[PDB]
Amino acid sequence: VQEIDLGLTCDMHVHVREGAMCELVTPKIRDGGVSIAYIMPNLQPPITTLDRVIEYKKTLQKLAPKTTFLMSFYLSKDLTPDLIHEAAQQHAIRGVKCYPAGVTTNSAAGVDPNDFSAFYPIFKAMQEENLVLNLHGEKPSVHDGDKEPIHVLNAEEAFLPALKKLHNDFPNLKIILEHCTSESAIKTIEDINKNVKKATDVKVAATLTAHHLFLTIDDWAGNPVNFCKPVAKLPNDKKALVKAAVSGKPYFFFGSDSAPHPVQNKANYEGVCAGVYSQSFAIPYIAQVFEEQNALENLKGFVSDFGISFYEVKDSEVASSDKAILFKKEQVIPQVISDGKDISIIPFKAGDKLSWSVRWEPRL
C-alpha cells in the first residue's frame, strides 16, 4: 500500500460539545488523523469565563491524552480586557471565536456584526497578546429594506466588508475567516494577501471544511444530514474552494467544522440542527479530494504545515510527537457513529468508500 507521511496534522475548527457526546467524539479526533485540535466554545452556556476554559481543556486531555488542544473564548459582552490578558498569560486560550447572533446554532445572543466597534477594547488586548480572531463570516439575515436582502446564500459575501475593516483597524491582529463557502470570499482572501511572500507574513487566513469540498446546494436541500452553517452553495463556489484547497497558498488551511448532532436532532420536521460530523475520517476525507485532484504533494501543508505556522504551534505544547501516516487502504464509512447508549451520529458521506486510512508512527 502506498503511503504518505504528514507529520503533526491540524484541525483548526473542532466542535466536541459536552457530556456523553464529548466522551464519544473527543477520542475520534485522533482516529481522524489529527494531532492538534482548535476547540470552538459555542457551549450551553458559551465559554466566557477563565474558570470554564481551564476546566474544559483538562476534561478533553483526560479524554484524549495524546491530542494537542488549543482552546478559545466565545466573544461575548461579558469579556473585559483584563480577562483577555490574564487568560493569555496563563496559556488558557489561543484565540476568540466570534459568532454573529442568529445565524448558526448556539450563537444567540452573541454579537451584532455590522458593528464590531463595541469589541475593539477586546481586539486591542488580543492583538497585544498574539491571540487569533476566528470569524464565522455571515451577516445575519435581514430581508426587507433599507439595504440589500440578506439570505443564506449571500450572508457570507455580505459579511466580507466587515472582515476588511477589521484587518485595517487592527493590521497586526491575526484574523481567520472560518469555513469559507463562496468564491467571492476566496478572492477576498487572496487579495488581502496579494504581496505576501513566505507564510510568516500572513495575518488574515481562511479555513476550509471537509464537507464544503464535496457538497453543493443540491446535496443538502432535502437532506438535513448535509445541513450546516454556512450553507454549501453553488457548484462554482465549490470549484473555488477545491481550487483554493489544493493551491498550496499559506492562507488556506484545514478546519473541519465537525459538529456532532444526535440523529434525533437532525430528523426534525422544523428547526433542523446545523452541523456535519467529519471528525471520524477527517484527513481521509481530505486526501480523497487531493487524490481526485491529482495534487497530493500539496496536502501536507493544508492539513499540517500552514496551520501550525499561523497559530504558532511550538513543539513544546504539543501533547504527542507521533506522526499521521496515510496509507492507501480502502475503507467504508459506517452508517452511524454511536456510544452504544443514547447518542448516535450520522457520519459525512456514510456508506461511501475512501482510498486512504490513517495510522500513527512515533518519532525517532
Next chain:
Amino acid sequence: VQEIDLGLTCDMHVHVREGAMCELVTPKIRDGGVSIAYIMPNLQPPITTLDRVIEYKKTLQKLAPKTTFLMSFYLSKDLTPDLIHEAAQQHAIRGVKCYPAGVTTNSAAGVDPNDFSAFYPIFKAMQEENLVLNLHGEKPSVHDGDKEPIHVLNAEEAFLPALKKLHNDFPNLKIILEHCTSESAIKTIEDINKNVKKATDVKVAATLTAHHLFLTIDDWAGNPVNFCKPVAKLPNDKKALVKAAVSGKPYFFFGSDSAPHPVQNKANYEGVCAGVYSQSFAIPYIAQVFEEQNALENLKGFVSDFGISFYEVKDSEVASSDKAILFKKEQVIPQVISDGKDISIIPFKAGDKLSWSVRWEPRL
C-alpha cells in the same frame, strides 16, 4: 372592506393522494374555500388509464360532492394519442401533467426534458382536443462539470428555453408553467404575452402557489415542512411572484400545489419528501397576501376569474354553484392536521394567525 364575494374559486393544482390520506384531504378542498379544483395524477402507480382516472374521479365525488373535480393524466411513456381522444371525448381528463424524472415526489415514472420529441405525437392530440398541458418546469440536476451545472436553484430557469420551444411548435395548445418560483420565469411569461389584454387569448399561462408567495430559501433551509419542488428561491424572486400575483393580468392565477405527506415523511435526516400542505386554508392564505399588498380588488380575478377563463369552465359541470364568501374573522392555523387514526399532516404556517376566514353561501 370586510366580506368579499369570490364566487366559484379556482385551485388549478391540487394533490389528494389516495387511501386514508384522500379521506382526510378531499373534504378540505371545500374547507379551504375552493369549489373548483384541478387534480394532479402522481399516485402509486401513476394515473394513466381511463379505468383509474374515472374511478378516482368517482371516489373523489363520494368524499366531497359539492367540490368540482377536473382530472388529469400522468405524462408517461405508457400513453397513446388514441388514449387522448378516447378520454377527451368521454369527458374524463382536462389535461396531462408533465413530470420530469426524479425531481419530486412520485416523479420516478417521469420524462426526460432534454428530449420531449417522443411525446410530440401526444401534444399533437392534446392540441386537437383543446386540452391543457401542465408543465412542472424543472430540468433534473446535472453535476456534470463539462456542460453547465443544473441545480435546484436554477433548474426552473433552465426549463424556460424548452417551454419557448413547446410554444412555437404547438401555438394553440393551452400550456401552463406550473408553480412559478423565479423572476426569470415571470419575465418569460410576461414576454410570451407581449400583446394580450383580456383574457381568453392567453394560451401560455402560469400558476402561482400560496407558499411561494411567502417563502424564501431561508424558510426551508432547516425546516423540512417548507421544502417543496421547485424550491423557494431568493427574495428578488419572491418579489417577482408577489408583483405577478396581485398583478391583475390574466396569465397568472392560483394553483396551491398543496401536497400532503404524513409528518414522518418530513422528519427525516435524509431524503425528506417534498411538498407543502395548504389545502385546509388555501384561500385565506392568498387573501392575506392580497391584503398586505393593498390590492384586494384583484383577489377575485387571481383566485377565480382568470383560472375559469383559461380552463373554460362551463356552467354545465360545476358540482355546486355555491359562492365562496371571504369574511374577515381571525383564525389560528393548527399545529397538526389530524385524522384521529394514522395520518398526521403539518399545515403551512402552522401556528400563525390569519386575517381572514371563508364560509359558503348558495346563489339564490
